[PDB]
Design an enzyme around this catalytic site. Structure first.
Site, short mmCIF file in Angstrom:
data_model
loop_
_atom_site.label_atom_id
_atom_site.label_comp_id
_atom_site.label_asym_id
_atom_site.label_seq_id
_atom_site.Cartn_x
_atom_site.Cartn_y
_atom_site.Cartn_z
N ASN A 113 0.90 -1.24 0.11
CA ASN A 113 0.03 0.13 -0.06
C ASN A 113 0.83 1.28 -0.12
O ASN A 113 1.94 1.21 0.37
CB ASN A 113 -0.93 -0.09 1.25
CG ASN A 113 -0.35 0.55 2.33
OD1 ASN A 113 -0.03 1.66 2.56
ND2 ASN A 113 0.23 -0.36 3.32
N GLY A 116 -0.34 6.89 2.14
CA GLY A 116 0.06 8.32 2.38
C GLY A 116 -1.01 9.05 3.73
O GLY A 116 -1.15 10.28 3.35
N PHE A 117 -1.49 8.40 4.54
CA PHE A 117 -1.99 9.05 5.36
C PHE A 117 -3.48 9.80 4.91
O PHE A 117 -3.67 10.76 5.36
CB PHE A 117 -1.32 10.11 6.49
CG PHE A 117 -0.23 9.31 7.24
CD1 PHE A 117 -0.30 8.08 7.60
CD2 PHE A 117 0.70 10.09 7.75
CE1 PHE A 117 0.35 7.63 8.66
CE2 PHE A 117 1.62 9.69 8.58
CZ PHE A 117 1.59 8.09 9.01
N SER A 184 5.28 4.90 8.95
CA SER A 184 5.16 4.71 7.77
C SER A 184 6.03 5.06 6.65
O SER A 184 6.78 6.09 6.79
CB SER A 184 3.81 5.91 7.49
OG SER A 184 3.21 5.99 6.40
N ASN A 186 5.08 5.81 3.58
CA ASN A 186 4.53 6.55 2.49
C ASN A 186 4.35 7.84 2.80
O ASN A 186 3.50 8.51 2.14
CB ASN A 186 3.17 5.72 2.13
CG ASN A 186 3.31 4.16 2.38
OD1 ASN A 186 4.10 3.76 1.33
ND2 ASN A 186 2.27 3.57 2.58
N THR A 187 4.91 8.29 3.67
CA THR A 187 5.39 9.73 3.65
C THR A 187 6.58 10.35 3.90
O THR A 187 7.10 10.00 4.61
CB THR A 187 4.47 10.49 5.05
OG1 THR A 187 4.74 9.59 6.12
CG2 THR A 187 2.98 10.27 4.69
N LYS A 238 5.23 3.13 17.37
CA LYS A 238 4.99 2.18 16.46
C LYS A 238 6.32 2.15 15.64
O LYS A 238 6.67 3.36 14.89
CB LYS A 238 3.84 2.32 15.47
CG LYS A 238 3.53 1.05 14.53
CD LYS A 238 2.16 0.77 13.75
CE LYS A 238 2.20 -0.36 13.13
NZ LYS A 238 0.79 -0.32 12.50
N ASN A 267 5.45 -1.81 11.90
CA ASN A 267 4.71 -1.47 10.62
C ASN A 267 5.29 -2.25 9.50
O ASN A 267 5.96 -3.20 9.71
CB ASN A 267 5.08 0.17 10.49
CG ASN A 267 3.90 0.99 9.96
OD1 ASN A 267 3.45 0.42 9.05
ND2 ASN A 267 3.83 1.99 10.37
N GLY A 316 1.98 -10.17 9.82
CA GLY A 316 1.71 -11.51 9.41
C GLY A 316 1.03 -12.27 10.44
O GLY A 316 1.50 -13.63 10.41
C1 LIG Z 1 -3.88 -0.37 3.73
C2 LIG Z 1 -2.88 -0.25 4.98
C3 LIG Z 1 -3.00 0.82 5.73
C4 LIG Z 1 -2.18 1.00 6.85
N1 LIG Z 1 -2.35 2.31 7.62
C5 LIG Z 1 -1.84 2.47 8.63
C6 LIG Z 1 -1.62 3.36 9.27
O1 LIG Z 1 -2.57 4.42 9.05
N2 LIG Z 1 -0.89 3.67 10.44
C7 LIG Z 1 -0.28 2.49 11.08
O2 LIG Z 1 0.47 2.74 12.06
N3 LIG Z 1 -0.10 1.53 10.34
C8 LIG Z 1 -0.72 1.36 9.14
N4 LIG Z 1 -0.80 0.35 8.52
C9 LIG Z 1 0.10 -0.99 8.88
C10 LIG Z 1 -0.82 -1.85 9.81
O3 LIG Z 1 -1.26 -1.37 10.75
C11 LIG Z 1 0.13 -3.01 10.17
O4 LIG Z 1 1.13 -2.43 11.09
C12 LIG Z 1 1.05 -3.80 9.19
O5 LIG Z 1 -0.02 -4.04 7.94
C13 LIG Z 1 1.25 -5.22 9.40
O6 LIG Z 1 0.29 -5.83 9.86
P1 LIG Z 1 -0.31 -7.38 9.20
O7 LIG Z 1 0.56 -7.90 8.55
O8 LIG Z 1 -1.32 -8.34 9.86
O9 LIG Z 1 -1.17 -6.85 7.92
C14 LIG Z 1 -1.60 -0.08 7.26
C15 LIG Z 1 -1.50 -1.19 6.46
C16 LIG Z 1 -2.09 -1.34 5.39
C17 LIG Z 1 -2.01 -2.68 4.58
O1 LIG Z 2 -1.23 5.63 5.40
C1 LIG Z 2 -0.33 4.95 4.96
O2 LIG Z 2 0.03 4.82 3.54
C2 LIG Z 2 0.55 4.06 5.58
C3 LIG Z 2 0.84 4.23 6.91
C4 LIG Z 2 1.59 3.36 7.77
O3 LIG Z 2 1.99 3.61 9.19
N1 LIG Z 2 1.87 2.13 7.27
C5 LIG Z 2 1.44 1.79 5.96
O4 LIG Z 2 1.65 0.55 5.56
N2 LIG Z 2 0.87 2.83 5.33
#
Ligand SMILES: Cc1cc2nc3c(=O)[nH]c(=O)nc-3n(C[C@H](O)[C@H](O)[C@H](O)COP(=O)(O)O)c2cc1C
Ligand SMILES: O=C(O)c1cc(=O)[nH]c(=O)[nH]1
Ligand SMILES: Cc1cc(Nc2ccc3ccccc3c2)[n+]2[nH]c[nH+]c2n1
Ligand SMILES: CCCCCCCCCCCC[N+](C)(C)[O-]
Length: 375
Positions: A113, A116-117, A184, A186-187, A238, A267, A316
Protein backbone atom coordinates in the site's frame (compact mmCIF):
# COMPACT_ATOMS: atom_id res chain seq x y z
CA UNK A 1 -23.19 -20.36 11.55
CA UNK A 2 -24.97 -18.77 8.58
CA UNK A 3 -23.88 -15.14 9.02
CA UNK A 4 -20.14 -15.84 8.89
CA UNK A 5 -20.63 -18.38 6.09
CA UNK A 6 -22.38 -15.92 3.77
CA UNK A 7 -19.80 -13.20 4.43
CA UNK A 8 -16.95 -15.62 3.69
CA UNK A 9 -18.45 -16.30 0.25
CA UNK A 10 -18.97 -12.60 -0.45
CA UNK A 11 -15.47 -11.71 0.75
CA UNK A 12 -13.83 -14.38 -1.41
CA UNK A 13 -15.80 -13.09 -4.40
CA UNK A 14 -14.72 -9.53 -3.58
CA UNK A 15 -11.06 -10.57 -3.37
CA UNK A 16 -11.02 -12.00 -6.89
CA UNK A 17 -12.85 -9.26 -8.80
CA UNK A 18 -13.14 -5.97 -6.89
CA UNK A 19 -10.44 -3.36 -6.30
CA UNK A 20 -8.99 -3.49 -2.81
CA UNK A 21 -9.72 0.08 -1.74
CA UNK A 22 -13.30 -0.36 -2.99
CA UNK A 23 -13.64 -3.59 -1.00
CA UNK A 24 -12.31 -2.04 2.21
CA UNK A 25 -14.66 0.94 1.96
CA UNK A 26 -17.59 -1.35 1.13
CA UNK A 27 -17.17 -3.44 4.29
CA UNK A 28 -16.54 -0.34 6.41
CA UNK A 29 -19.91 0.88 5.13
CA UNK A 30 -21.62 -2.43 5.94
CA UNK A 31 -20.17 -2.11 9.43
CA UNK A 32 -21.37 1.48 9.71
CA UNK A 33 -24.86 0.18 8.92
CA UNK A 34 -24.37 -2.54 11.58
CA UNK A 35 -25.01 -5.55 9.35
CA UNK A 36 -21.82 -7.46 10.09
CA UNK A 37 -21.88 -10.53 12.37
CA UNK A 38 -21.37 -10.40 16.12
CA UNK A 39 -19.18 -12.52 18.38
CA UNK A 40 -21.10 -12.53 21.66
CA UNK A 41 -19.10 -15.33 23.32
CA UNK A 42 -17.35 -14.93 26.65
CA UNK A 43 -13.61 -14.78 26.06
CA UNK A 44 -11.42 -17.25 27.94
CA UNK A 45 -10.27 -15.82 31.26
CA UNK A 46 -6.91 -17.52 30.60
CA UNK A 47 -6.22 -15.47 27.44
CA UNK A 48 -6.76 -11.99 28.90
CA UNK A 49 -3.72 -9.72 29.00
CA UNK A 50 -2.62 -6.22 29.90
CA UNK A 51 -0.10 -3.46 29.26
CA UNK A 52 0.59 -1.77 32.61
CA UNK A 53 -2.86 -0.88 34.02
CA UNK A 54 -4.55 -1.22 30.59
CA UNK A 55 -6.64 -4.40 30.59
CA UNK A 56 -7.59 -6.33 27.45
CA UNK A 57 -10.41 -8.88 27.62
CA UNK A 58 -8.59 -10.89 24.94
CA UNK A 59 -5.26 -10.54 23.14
CA UNK A 60 -6.39 -9.64 19.58
CA UNK A 61 -7.10 -6.17 18.23
CA UNK A 62 -7.21 -4.37 14.90
CA UNK A 63 -4.14 -2.43 13.80
CA UNK A 64 -4.04 1.20 12.72
CA UNK A 65 -5.00 2.06 9.16
CA UNK A 66 -8.04 -0.24 9.13
CA UNK A 67 -10.68 2.20 10.42
CA UNK A 68 -8.60 5.33 9.85
CA UNK A 69 -11.48 7.70 10.61
CA UNK A 70 -13.35 5.83 13.36
CA UNK A 71 -16.48 5.39 11.23
CA UNK A 72 -16.85 1.68 12.02
CA UNK A 73 -15.56 1.13 15.57
CA UNK A 74 -18.59 -0.63 17.09
CA UNK A 75 -19.02 -3.26 14.39
CA UNK A 76 -15.32 -4.11 14.05
CA UNK A 77 -15.01 -4.59 17.81
CA UNK A 78 -18.16 -6.73 17.91
CA UNK A 79 -16.46 -9.16 15.50
CA UNK A 80 -14.63 -10.40 18.61
CA UNK A 81 -11.68 -8.04 19.04
CA UNK A 82 -10.70 -6.59 22.40
CA UNK A 83 -9.44 -3.30 20.97
CA UNK A 84 -8.90 -1.21 17.85
CA UNK A 85 -6.34 1.44 16.97
CA UNK A 86 -7.99 4.12 14.83
CA UNK A 87 -5.97 6.46 12.67
CA UNK A 88 -3.39 7.21 11.76
CA UNK A 89 -4.90 10.69 11.93
CA UNK A 90 -3.33 14.05 11.07
CA UNK A 91 -4.42 17.51 12.26
CA UNK A 92 -5.90 18.39 8.85
CA UNK A 93 -7.65 16.06 6.45
CA UNK A 94 -5.65 14.71 3.52
CA UNK A 95 -6.48 12.91 0.29
CA UNK A 96 -3.30 10.83 0.40
CA UNK A 97 -1.31 9.67 -2.59
CA UNK A 98 -2.68 8.81 -6.03
CA UNK A 99 -4.83 5.77 -6.79
CA UNK A 100 -4.41 2.90 -7.24
CA UNK A 101 -2.60 2.65 -3.90
CA UNK A 102 -3.30 -0.82 -2.43
CA UNK A 103 -2.79 -4.23 -4.03
CA UNK A 104 -3.30 -7.76 -2.72
CA UNK A 105 -1.61 -11.05 -3.58
CA UNK A 106 -3.86 -13.86 -2.39
CA UNK A 107 -1.41 -16.75 -2.84
CA UNK A 108 1.20 -15.15 -0.57
CA UNK A 109 -1.44 -13.55 1.69
CA UNK A 110 0.41 -10.25 1.36
CA UNK A 111 -0.53 -6.62 0.71
CA UNK A 112 1.31 -3.52 -0.49
CA UNK A 113 0.00 0.00 0.00
CA UNK A 114 1.00 3.60 -0.69
CA UNK A 115 -1.88 5.49 0.91
CA UNK A 116 0.09 8.32 2.53
CA UNK A 117 -2.18 9.02 5.53
CA UNK A 118 -5.49 9.60 3.78
CA UNK A 119 -7.83 10.60 6.62
CA UNK A 120 -10.62 13.03 7.44
CA UNK A 121 -8.51 14.98 9.94
CA UNK A 122 -8.36 15.20 13.71
CA UNK A 123 -11.47 17.34 14.22
CA UNK A 124 -13.83 15.07 12.27
CA UNK A 125 -12.35 11.86 13.67
CA UNK A 126 -12.60 13.29 17.19
CA UNK A 127 -16.33 13.84 16.64
CA UNK A 128 -16.64 10.24 15.41
CA UNK A 129 -14.86 8.87 18.49
CA UNK A 130 -16.98 10.99 20.85
CA UNK A 131 -20.11 9.54 19.25
CA UNK A 132 -18.66 6.05 19.69
CA UNK A 133 -17.91 6.73 23.35
CA UNK A 134 -21.54 7.74 23.88
CA UNK A 135 -22.80 4.59 22.15
CA UNK A 136 -20.32 2.57 24.19
CA UNK A 137 -21.92 3.47 27.52
CA UNK A 138 -25.29 2.07 26.38
CA UNK A 139 -24.14 -1.11 24.56
CA UNK A 140 -23.45 -4.27 26.58
CA UNK A 141 -21.06 -5.63 23.94
CA UNK A 142 -18.79 -2.56 23.97
CA UNK A 143 -17.97 -2.50 27.70
CA UNK A 144 -14.27 -2.84 28.55
CA UNK A 145 -13.26 -2.65 24.87
CA UNK A 146 -10.22 -0.44 24.26
CA UNK A 147 -9.79 2.23 21.57
CA UNK A 148 -6.35 3.66 20.86
CA UNK A 149 -5.59 6.53 18.49
CA UNK A 150 -2.60 6.56 16.14
CA UNK A 151 -1.33 10.08 15.43
CA UNK A 152 1.02 11.44 12.78
CA UNK A 153 1.67 14.52 10.65
CA UNK A 154 0.31 16.03 7.46
CA UNK A 155 2.34 15.44 4.31
CA UNK A 156 3.68 19.01 4.02
CA UNK A 157 4.12 19.56 7.76
CA UNK A 158 7.73 20.26 8.70
CA UNK A 159 7.41 20.23 12.52
CA UNK A 160 6.01 16.79 13.35
CA UNK A 161 5.79 17.71 17.04
CA UNK A 162 3.41 20.58 16.27
CA UNK A 163 1.05 18.13 14.57
CA UNK A 164 1.31 15.55 17.36
CA UNK A 165 0.53 18.17 20.02
CA UNK A 166 -2.55 19.37 18.13
CA UNK A 167 -4.04 15.88 17.86
CA UNK A 168 -3.48 15.14 21.55
CA UNK A 169 -5.30 18.30 22.65
CA UNK A 170 -8.29 17.48 20.43
CA UNK A 171 -8.72 13.73 20.88
CA UNK A 172 -6.54 12.68 23.82
CA UNK A 173 -9.44 12.82 26.29
CA UNK A 174 -11.30 10.07 24.40
CA UNK A 175 -8.36 7.70 23.83
CA UNK A 176 -7.29 4.79 26.00
CA UNK A 177 -3.80 5.05 24.49
CA UNK A 178 -1.95 7.18 21.94
CA UNK A 179 0.23 5.57 19.27
CA UNK A 180 3.00 7.77 17.85
CA UNK A 181 3.40 6.83 14.17
CA UNK A 182 6.97 7.49 13.01
CA UNK A 183 7.16 4.37 10.83
CA UNK A 184 4.92 4.82 7.78
CA UNK A 185 6.90 4.37 4.53
CA UNK A 186 4.43 6.43 2.48
CA UNK A 187 5.15 9.96 3.76
CA UNK A 188 8.66 11.16 2.82
CA UNK A 189 11.03 11.76 5.71
CA UNK A 190 8.72 10.43 8.43
CA UNK A 191 10.90 7.44 9.33
CA UNK A 192 13.84 9.79 9.91
CA UNK A 193 12.08 10.72 13.17
CA UNK A 194 13.13 7.31 14.51
CA UNK A 195 16.63 8.71 15.04
CA UNK A 196 17.30 8.65 18.77
CA UNK A 197 17.59 12.42 19.18
CA UNK A 198 14.40 13.27 17.29
CA UNK A 199 12.50 10.34 18.81
CA UNK A 200 13.28 11.29 22.42
CA UNK A 201 12.11 14.87 21.89
CA UNK A 202 8.93 13.60 20.23
CA UNK A 203 8.06 11.20 23.07
CA UNK A 204 8.67 13.82 25.76
CA UNK A 205 6.56 16.40 23.92
CA UNK A 206 3.73 13.88 23.51
CA UNK A 207 3.80 12.86 27.18
CA UNK A 208 3.91 16.55 28.14
CA UNK A 209 0.78 17.47 26.17
CA UNK A 210 -1.09 14.51 27.67
CA UNK A 211 -0.15 15.60 31.19
CA UNK A 212 -1.33 19.12 30.36
CA UNK A 213 -4.82 17.78 29.60
CA UNK A 214 -5.40 16.90 33.26
CA UNK A 215 -4.10 20.28 34.42
CA UNK A 216 -6.46 23.26 34.03
CA UNK A 217 -9.63 21.15 34.34
CA UNK A 218 -12.34 21.49 36.98
CA UNK A 219 -14.12 18.12 36.70
CA UNK A 220 -13.38 14.88 38.50
CA UNK A 221 -11.47 12.28 36.49
CA UNK A 222 -14.64 10.33 35.70
CA UNK A 223 -15.75 13.24 33.48
CA UNK A 224 -12.37 14.35 32.09
CA UNK A 225 -11.34 10.96 30.67
CA UNK A 226 -14.29 10.03 28.46
CA UNK A 227 -12.70 6.73 27.47
CA UNK A 228 -12.67 3.14 28.73
CA UNK A 229 -9.96 3.32 31.42
CA UNK A 230 -11.14 6.66 32.85
CA UNK A 231 -7.40 7.44 33.04
CA UNK A 232 -5.04 9.45 30.87
CA UNK A 233 -4.05 7.59 27.69
CA UNK A 234 -0.90 5.50 27.68
CA UNK A 235 1.79 6.34 25.12
CA UNK A 236 3.07 3.84 22.55
CA UNK A 237 5.40 4.20 19.57
CA UNK A 238 5.10 2.16 16.38
CA UNK A 239 8.45 1.19 14.86
CA UNK A 240 9.36 0.21 11.30
CA UNK A 241 11.24 -3.06 10.66
CA UNK A 242 13.67 -1.37 8.24
CA UNK A 243 16.45 -0.48 10.67
CA UNK A 244 19.97 -1.71 11.33
CA UNK A 245 21.03 -3.22 14.64
CA UNK A 246 22.67 -0.06 15.98
CA UNK A 247 19.54 1.99 15.24
CA UNK A 248 17.44 -0.53 17.17
CA UNK A 249 19.78 -0.27 20.17
CA UNK A 250 19.67 3.54 20.24
CA UNK A 251 15.87 3.50 19.99
CA UNK A 252 15.67 0.98 22.84
CA UNK A 253 17.68 3.29 25.09
CA UNK A 254 15.37 6.22 24.32
CA UNK A 255 12.26 4.20 25.17
CA UNK A 256 13.73 3.26 28.55
CA UNK A 257 14.91 6.81 29.27
CA UNK A 258 11.50 8.29 28.40
CA UNK A 259 9.58 5.55 30.26
CA UNK A 260 7.29 4.92 27.29
CA UNK A 261 4.37 2.64 28.08
CA UNK A 262 4.79 0.27 25.12
CA UNK A 263 6.04 -0.26 21.60
CA UNK A 264 4.17 -1.55 18.55
CA UNK A 265 6.31 -3.96 16.51
CA UNK A 266 5.91 -3.42 13.67
CA UNK A 267 4.80 -1.35 10.68
CA UNK A 268 5.12 -2.43 7.04
CA UNK A 269 8.44 -3.12 5.33
CA UNK A 270 10.13 -2.24 2.04
CA UNK A 271 12.68 -5.09 2.11
CA UNK A 272 10.35 -7.63 0.47
CA UNK A 273 11.22 -7.87 -3.23
CA UNK A 274 10.19 -11.43 -4.15
CA UNK A 275 6.44 -10.96 -4.74
CA UNK A 276 6.01 -11.15 -8.51
CA UNK A 277 2.76 -9.18 -8.73
CA UNK A 278 4.28 -6.36 -6.63
CA UNK A 279 7.53 -5.89 -8.57
CA UNK A 280 6.31 -2.69 -10.26
CA UNK A 281 4.32 -1.40 -7.26
CA UNK A 282 5.18 1.24 -4.66
CA UNK A 283 4.67 1.16 -0.90
CA UNK A 284 5.14 -0.96 2.20
CA UNK A 285 4.34 -4.66 2.39
CA UNK A 286 2.03 -6.42 4.86
CA UNK A 287 0.98 -10.00 5.48
CA UNK A 288 2.58 -13.40 5.73
CA UNK A 289 5.87 -12.40 4.08
CA UNK A 290 6.29 -9.89 6.94
CA UNK A 291 5.71 -12.35 9.81
CA UNK A 292 9.26 -13.68 10.23
CA UNK A 293 10.87 -10.23 9.92
CA UNK A 294 8.55 -8.72 12.53
CA UNK A 295 8.83 -11.66 14.95
CA UNK A 296 12.62 -11.28 14.89
CA UNK A 297 12.23 -7.54 15.49
CA UNK A 298 10.18 -8.38 18.60
CA UNK A 299 12.89 -10.66 20.02
CA UNK A 300 15.57 -8.01 19.43
CA UNK A 301 13.73 -5.10 21.08
CA UNK A 302 12.62 -7.33 23.96
CA UNK A 303 16.33 -7.96 24.56
CA UNK A 304 17.56 -4.40 23.97
CA UNK A 305 14.96 -3.03 26.41
CA UNK A 306 15.60 -5.81 28.97
CA UNK A 307 11.93 -6.89 28.92
CA UNK A 308 10.95 -3.56 30.52
CA UNK A 309 8.83 -2.16 27.66
CA UNK A 310 5.59 -4.03 26.80
CA UNK A 311 5.18 -5.00 23.15
CA UNK A 312 2.18 -4.93 20.81
CA UNK A 313 2.73 -7.39 17.96
CA UNK A 314 1.88 -6.42 14.38
CA UNK A 315 2.90 -8.31 11.26
CA UNK A 316 1.70 -11.42 9.47
CA UNK A 317 -0.53 -12.79 12.25
CA UNK A 318 -3.09 -15.18 10.75
CA UNK A 319 -3.31 -18.22 13.05
CA UNK A 320 -3.19 -19.03 16.74
CA UNK A 321 0.25 -20.48 16.06
CA UNK A 322 1.39 -17.17 14.56
CA UNK A 323 0.01 -15.40 17.63
CA UNK A 324 1.85 -17.67 20.08
CA UNK A 325 5.08 -17.06 18.17
CA UNK A 326 4.58 -13.32 18.72
CA UNK A 327 3.73 -13.87 22.39
CA UNK A 328 6.59 -16.29 23.08
CA UNK A 329 8.87 -13.73 21.42
CA UNK A 330 7.85 -11.08 23.95
CA UNK A 331 4.54 -9.60 22.84
CA UNK A 332 1.71 -9.06 25.32
CA UNK A 333 -1.00 -8.36 22.71
CA UNK A 334 -1.51 -8.93 18.99
CA UNK A 335 -2.93 -6.72 16.22
CA UNK A 336 -4.47 -7.98 12.98
CA UNK A 337 -4.91 -6.31 9.60
CA UNK A 338 -4.09 -8.54 6.62
CA UNK A 339 -5.82 -11.48 8.32
CA UNK A 340 -9.13 -9.61 8.11
CA UNK A 341 -8.52 -9.01 4.40
CA UNK A 342 -7.98 -12.67 3.50
CA UNK A 343 -9.84 -14.55 6.27
CA UNK A 344 -12.77 -12.15 6.63
CA UNK A 345 -15.33 -11.71 9.37
CA UNK A 346 -14.33 -14.89 11.25
CA UNK A 347 -10.73 -13.79 11.89
CA UNK A 348 -11.22 -13.01 15.59
CA UNK A 349 -13.48 -15.95 16.46
CA UNK A 350 -11.16 -18.35 14.64
CA UNK A 351 -7.83 -17.07 15.93
CA UNK A 352 -9.06 -16.82 19.54
CA UNK A 353 -10.10 -20.48 19.50
CA UNK A 354 -6.83 -21.59 17.89
CA UNK A 355 -4.78 -19.73 20.51
CA UNK A 356 -6.82 -21.16 23.40
CA UNK A 357 -6.37 -24.74 22.18
CA UNK A 358 -2.65 -24.09 21.66
CA UNK A 359 -2.13 -22.59 25.12
CA UNK A 360 -3.65 -25.78 26.55
CA UNK A 361 -1.87 -28.41 24.44
CA UNK A 362 1.38 -26.50 25.09
CA UNK A 363 0.90 -26.64 28.86
CA UNK A 364 0.41 -22.95 29.68
CA UNK A 365 -1.83 -22.01 32.60
CA UNK A 366 -2.68 -18.71 30.90
CA UNK A 367 -1.45 -16.31 28.23
CA UNK A 368 0.69 -14.20 30.57
CA UNK A 369 2.84 -17.23 31.45
CA UNK A 370 3.80 -17.55 27.76
CA UNK A 371 5.02 -13.97 27.24
CA UNK A 372 8.70 -14.07 26.33
CA UNK A 373 9.20 -17.81 26.84
CA UNK A 374 11.06 -18.41 23.56
CA UNK A 375 14.08 -16.49 24.88
C1 LIG B 1 -3.82 -0.35 3.66
C2 LIG B 1 -2.99 -0.24 4.91
C3 LIG B 1 -3.05 0.93 5.66
C4 LIG B 1 -2.30 1.05 6.82
N1 LIG B 1 -2.36 2.22 7.54
C5 LIG B 1 -1.63 2.35 8.70
C6 LIG B 1 -1.71 3.53 9.44
O1 LIG B 1 -2.44 4.44 9.06
N2 LIG B 1 -0.98 3.67 10.59
C7 LIG B 1 -0.17 2.64 11.03
O2 LIG B 1 0.49 2.78 12.06
N3 LIG B 1 -0.08 1.48 10.30
C8 LIG B 1 -0.82 1.32 9.14
N4 LIG B 1 -0.74 0.15 8.41
C9 LIG B 1 0.15 -0.96 8.89
C10 LIG B 1 -0.68 -1.96 9.69
O3 LIG B 1 -1.27 -1.28 10.78
C11 LIG B 1 0.16 -3.12 10.21
O4 LIG B 1 1.13 -2.62 11.10
C12 LIG B 1 0.84 -3.87 9.07
O5 LIG B 1 -0.07 -4.00 7.99
C13 LIG B 1 1.32 -5.25 9.48
O6 LIG B 1 0.22 -6.02 9.92
P1 LIG B 1 -0.32 -7.27 9.06
O7 LIG B 1 0.85 -8.04 8.49
O8 LIG B 1 -1.16 -8.16 9.94
O9 LIG B 1 -1.16 -6.72 7.94
C14 LIG B 1 -1.48 0.01 7.24
C15 LIG B 1 -1.43 -1.16 6.49
C16 LIG B 1 -2.18 -1.29 5.33
C17 LIG B 1 -2.08 -2.57 4.55
O1 LIG C 1 -1.13 5.62 5.32
C1 LIG C 1 -0.24 4.83 4.83
O2 LIG C 1 0.02 4.88 3.61
C2 LIG C 1 0.49 3.84 5.72
C3 LIG C 1 0.82 4.18 6.99
C4 LIG C 1 1.48 3.30 7.79
O3 LIG C 1 1.77 3.60 8.91
N1 LIG C 1 1.79 2.07 7.31
C5 LIG C 1 1.47 1.73 6.06
O4 LIG C 1 1.75 0.64 5.63
N2 LIG C 1 0.80 2.63 5.26
C1 LIG D 1 -12.12 -8.45 0.52
C2 LIG D 1 -11.28 -7.31 1.05
C3 LIG D 1 -11.62 -6.69 2.25
C4 LIG D 1 -10.84 -5.67 2.72
N1 LIG D 1 -11.08 -4.96 3.92
C5 LIG D 1 -11.90 -5.37 5.00
C6 LIG D 1 -11.96 -6.68 5.48
C7 LIG D 1 -12.78 -6.99 6.56
C8 LIG D 1 -13.55 -5.97 7.19
C9 LIG D 1 -14.39 -6.27 8.29
C10 LIG D 1 -15.14 -5.26 8.90
C11 LIG D 1 -15.08 -3.96 8.42
C12 LIG D 1 -14.26 -3.66 7.34
C13 LIG D 1 -13.49 -4.69 6.73
C14 LIG D 1 -12.65 -4.38 5.62
N2 LIG D 1 -9.75 -5.25 1.99
N3 LIG D 1 -8.84 -4.25 2.27
C15 LIG D 1 -7.94 -4.22 1.27
N4 LIG D 1 -8.28 -5.19 0.38
C16 LIG D 1 -9.42 -5.83 0.85
N5 LIG D 1 -10.19 -6.88 0.36
C1 LIG E 1 -25.74 -11.33 5.21
C2 LIG E 1 -25.84 -11.74 6.68
C3 LIG E 1 -26.64 -10.72 7.49
C4 LIG E 1 -26.08 -10.56 8.90
C5 LIG E 1 -27.07 -9.78 9.77
C6 LIG E 1 -26.40 -8.82 10.75
C7 LIG E 1 -26.16 -9.48 12.11
N1 LIG E 1 -26.24 -8.53 13.21
C8 LIG E 1 -25.37 -9.01 14.30
C9 LIG E 1 -25.88 -7.14 12.89
O1 LIG E 1 -27.42 -8.53 13.62
Amino acid sequence: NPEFFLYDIFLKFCLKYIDGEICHDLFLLLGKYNILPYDTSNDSIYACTNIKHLDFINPFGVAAGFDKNGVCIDSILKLGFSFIEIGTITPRGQTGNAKPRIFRDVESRSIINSFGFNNMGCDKVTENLILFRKRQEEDKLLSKHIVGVSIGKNKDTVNIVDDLKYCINKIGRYADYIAINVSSPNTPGLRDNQEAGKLKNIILSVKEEIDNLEKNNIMNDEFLWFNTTKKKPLVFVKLAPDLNQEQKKEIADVLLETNIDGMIISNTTTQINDIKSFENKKGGVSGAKLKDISTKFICEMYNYTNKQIPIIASGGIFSGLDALEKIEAGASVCQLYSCLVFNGMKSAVQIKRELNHLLYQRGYYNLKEAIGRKH
